[PDB]
Amino acid sequence: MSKQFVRSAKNMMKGYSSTQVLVRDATANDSRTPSIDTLDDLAQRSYDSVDFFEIMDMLDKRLNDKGKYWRHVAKSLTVLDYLVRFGSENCVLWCRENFYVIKTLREFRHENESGFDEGQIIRVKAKELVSLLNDEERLREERSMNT
Amino acid sequence: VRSAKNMMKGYSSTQVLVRDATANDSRTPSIDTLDDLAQRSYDSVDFFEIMDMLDKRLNDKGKYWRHVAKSLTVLDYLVRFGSENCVLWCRENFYVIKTLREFRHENESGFDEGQIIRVKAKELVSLLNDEERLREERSMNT
């Protein structure tokens, strides 16, 4: 019967493409960090305009979430930080137009049922990206060494 | 004559059955409904339609707690009496089952209605945690 990759097609029936699958699996729901090859692949695929839209529209709905789904925002800021300084130049221009989205994540606070503020990592992760996008002299170089 | 309750544009027999099994009401899922879901979970295309709906129903919050609760009882029946791939689907999505162990909610009356979602989510994790008894339970299902 079905094995390992057939059960992973549960998202394929849910209307997803290869680019939409791995960017969805990148911002997973466990304490695992996205594999760099997935972040590297997303950077290379961001050059294609068809993939770049599906990538950004996916992270758009992953960043506007709150509640117990704090791993939607924390991991999306991680891949978005990689796309900004490794992928297409439109990844920078896209964050400049949706700038007030990560600007509101500056105050993300979600406490789980144990007195632990899980949103603290989302605070420093969002404040760092804003400080990077507002430094064009720094941001331009960071995209140069990664070539 | 009473096909009128098929006001379901887009969904199929399997998708409507699982939605009617986890609907937001006081009606409890019956065994003849659960055994049909377990029977259809053996079929390939029917299996994904059951998991795709339980996925959208388990990931609910707010006052729609009855969608999450019934999806746990339905999933428990699919782990034991359903297909083997149902257990594989629960292993790859074992975190969605654990995130509901911290679920909390109470209606505007004062009673914590999330108390039942926790216990149902807890015993399901401990069920999959005991892989020895799992094959034992799936063996009796002859």
PDB file of C-alpha atoms in Angstrom, chain A residues 1-4 6-10 13-14 24-25 28-30 68-69 71-72 112-113, chain B residues 42 48-49 52 55-56 59-61 85 88-89 91-96 99 102-104:
ATOM      1  CA  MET A   1       0.000   0.000   0.000  1.00  0.00           C
ATOM      2  CA  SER A   2       0.953   3.664   0.479  1.00  0.00           C
ATOM      3  CA  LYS A   3       4.332   4.460   2.003  1.00  0.00           C
ATOM      4  CA  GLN A   4       6.180   7.695   2.754  1.00  0.00           C
ATOM      5  CA  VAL A   6       2.175   8.899  -1.039  1.00  0.00           C
ATOM      6  CA  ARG A   7       0.905  10.034   2.366  1.00  0.00           C
ATOM      7  CA  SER A   8       2.719  13.344   1.805  1.00  0.00           C
ATOM      8  CA  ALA A   9       0.373  13.916  -1.165  1.00  0.00           C
ATOM      9  CA  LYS A  10      -2.408  14.827   1.284  1.00  0.00           C
ATOM     10  CA  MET A  13      -5.157  16.898  -3.311  1.00  0.00           C
ATOM     11  CA  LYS A  14      -5.602  20.112  -1.284  1.00  0.00           C
ATOM     12  CA  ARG A  24       4.329  25.160   3.295  1.00  0.00           C
ATOM     13  CA  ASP A  25       6.448  22.358   4.771  1.00  0.00           C
ATOM     14  CA  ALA A  28       6.139  23.468   9.828  1.00  0.00           C
ATOM     15  CA  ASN A  29       4.456  23.061  13.229  1.00  0.00           C
ATOM     16  CA  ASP A  30       7.236  21.267  15.155  1.00  0.00           C
ATOM     17  CA  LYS A  68      -1.426  28.939  19.358  1.00  0.00           C
ATOM     18  CA  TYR A  69      -0.150  28.924  15.754  1.00  0.00           C
ATOM     19  CA  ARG A  71       5.094  28.667  14.563  1.00  0.00           C
ATOM     20  CA  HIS A  72       3.385  30.060  11.454  1.00  0.00           C
ATOM     21  CA  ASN A 112       1.008  29.079  26.139  1.00  0.00           C
ATOM     22  CA  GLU A 113      -0.725  27.244  28.994  1.00  0.00           C
TER      23      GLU A 113
ATOM     24  CA  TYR B  42      -9.031   1.472   3.052  1.00  0.00           C
ATOM     25  CA  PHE B  48      -7.432  11.397   1.475  1.00  0.00           C
ATOM     26  CA  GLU B  49     -10.924  12.926   1.537  1.00  0.00           C
ATOM     27  CA  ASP B  52      -8.390  16.395   4.365  1.00  0.00           C
ATOM     28  CA  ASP B  55      -7.321  18.232   9.007  1.00  0.00           C
ATOM     29  CA  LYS B  56      -9.537  21.286   8.488  1.00  0.00           C
ATOM     30  CA  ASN B  59      -7.259  22.890  13.233  1.00  0.00           C
ATOM     31  CA  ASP B  60     -10.247  24.862  14.569  1.00  0.00           C
ATOM     32  CA  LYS B  61     -10.267  27.155  17.598  1.00  0.00           C
ATOM     33  CA  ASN B  85      -2.184   4.418   6.493  1.00  0.00           C
ATOM     34  CA  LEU B  88       0.852   6.676   9.179  1.00  0.00           C
ATOM     35  CA  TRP B  89      -1.160   9.870   8.693  1.00  0.00           C
ATOM     36  CA  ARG B  91       2.487   9.710  12.816  1.00  0.00           C
ATOM     37  CA  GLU B  92       3.438  12.396  10.289  1.00  0.00           C
ATOM     38  CA  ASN B  93       0.903  14.760  11.921  1.00  0.00           C
ATOM     39  CA  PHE B  94       1.614  13.778  15.536  1.00  0.00           C
ATOM     40  CA  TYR B  95       2.170  17.445  16.428  1.00  0.00           C
ATOM     41  CA  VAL B  96      -1.372  18.533  15.514  1.00  0.00           C
ATOM     42  CA  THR B  99      -1.103  20.876  20.203  1.00  0.00           C
ATOM     43  CA  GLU B 102      -3.244  22.381  25.607  1.00  0.00           C
ATOM     44  CA  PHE B 103      -6.671  23.380  24.266  1.00  0.00           C
ATOM     45  CA  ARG B 104      -8.745  25.613  26.537  1.00  0.00           C
TER      46      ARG B 104
END
